[PDB]
């Protein structure tokens, strides 16, 4: 098997077979198969559940606040204050359109925090593939 | 097993190449599986697949794509989510799809298709990504 730190990313089926006892961070290339939830602002923060896949598994995830804020361009506080002015709320709505699109089109390296007792992970950060990633994959296949 | 209103294929979308489908796939519609008798391992399940390719042809919700290994065909694209629009010849995209036919030309029923043309590296990695992954399934 593969250590869970091997660049440029690992596989969710490998992580599962590891049988981790504790909460474990890995990185994987996934896309969203589907949402399982509407955008929420409960708790004063953004949340959304999804099923992703990296080709080896399916996995329930929630996006962290910081991701969804950067996709929309608005925090929960900013969104509420946007509701008090028509022009600013419009910019929020375009933010929302953009985000919903981003999610449809998302295909990248997700840094996921996986809780083994709960079958549920948290997506901490996203990153697009680059030349370095490519080399790493080259090297790891000895090619 | 989720929200009502989300029902997904049983096993995940395995990354593949047209050629592999064309040659190593076995069974028939609804019962597909990939042969790994070459590396002496067991059959893998082909409900869904993850392919990538350049668009050659686009006709409504049909399309013919091509990866380094060859041509593959897609239908029902009129029913999947529409992100950045990418049913244009020359775009590089990814499909998630359910295998309809394998040979002589692989046909998928699309569940998703997504643009990947705003970053060349996707194309460079596709063939290695496929191989790396097949190597990490026991």
């Amino acid at each position: 098997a593969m250590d869970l730190y091997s660049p440029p990313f690992v596989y969710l089926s490998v992580l599962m077979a590891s049988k981790p006892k504790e909460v474990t961070t890995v990185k994987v290339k996934a896309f969203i198969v589907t949402l399982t939830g509407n955008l929420s602002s409960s708790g004063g923060i953004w949340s959304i559940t999804a099923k992703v896949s990296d080709g080896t598994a399916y996995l329930d995830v929630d996006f962290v606040d910081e991701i969804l804020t950067s996709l929309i361009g608005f925090s929960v506080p900013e969104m509420k204050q946007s509701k008090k002015d028509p022009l600013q709320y419009q910019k929020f709505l375009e933010g929302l359109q953009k985000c919903q699109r981003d999610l449809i089109d998302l295909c990248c390296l997700m840094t996921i925090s996986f809780n083994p007792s709960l079958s549920k992970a948290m997506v901490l950060a996203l990153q697009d593939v680059n030349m370095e990633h490519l080399e790493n994959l080259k090297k790891r296949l000895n090619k | 097993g989720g929200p009502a209103g989300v029902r997904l294929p049983r096993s995940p979308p395995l990354k593949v190449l047209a050629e592999q489908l064309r040659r190593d796939a076995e069974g028939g519609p609804g019962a597909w599986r990939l042969s790994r008798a070459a590396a002496g391992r067991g059959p893998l399940d082909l409900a869904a697949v993850w392919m990538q390719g350049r668009v050659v042809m686009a006709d409504r919700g049909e399309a013919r794509l091509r990866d380094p290994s060859g041509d593959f065909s897609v239908r029902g694209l009129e029913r999947v989510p529409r992100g950045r629009p990418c049913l244009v010849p020359g775009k590089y995209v990814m499909v998630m799809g359910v295998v309809q036919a394998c040979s002589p030309e692989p046909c998928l029923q699309a569940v998703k298709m997504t643009d990947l043309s705003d970053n060349p590296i996707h194309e460079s990695m596709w063939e290695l990504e496929v191989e790396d992954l097949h190597r990490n399934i026991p």
């Binding site: 969203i32 198969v33 589907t34 949402l35 399982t36 919903q100 999610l103 449809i104 | 929200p3 209103g5 989300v6 029902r7 997904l8 294929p9 029902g76 029913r79 999947v80 989510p81 359910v98 029923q109 699309a110 569940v111 998703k112």
Partner: peptide, 13 residues
């Protein structure tokens, strides 16, 4: 098959 993004999308299965 069904998935949800901005809305539900349904796929012949």
């Amino acid at each position: 098959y069904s998935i949800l993004f901005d809305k539900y999308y349904s796929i012949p299965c």
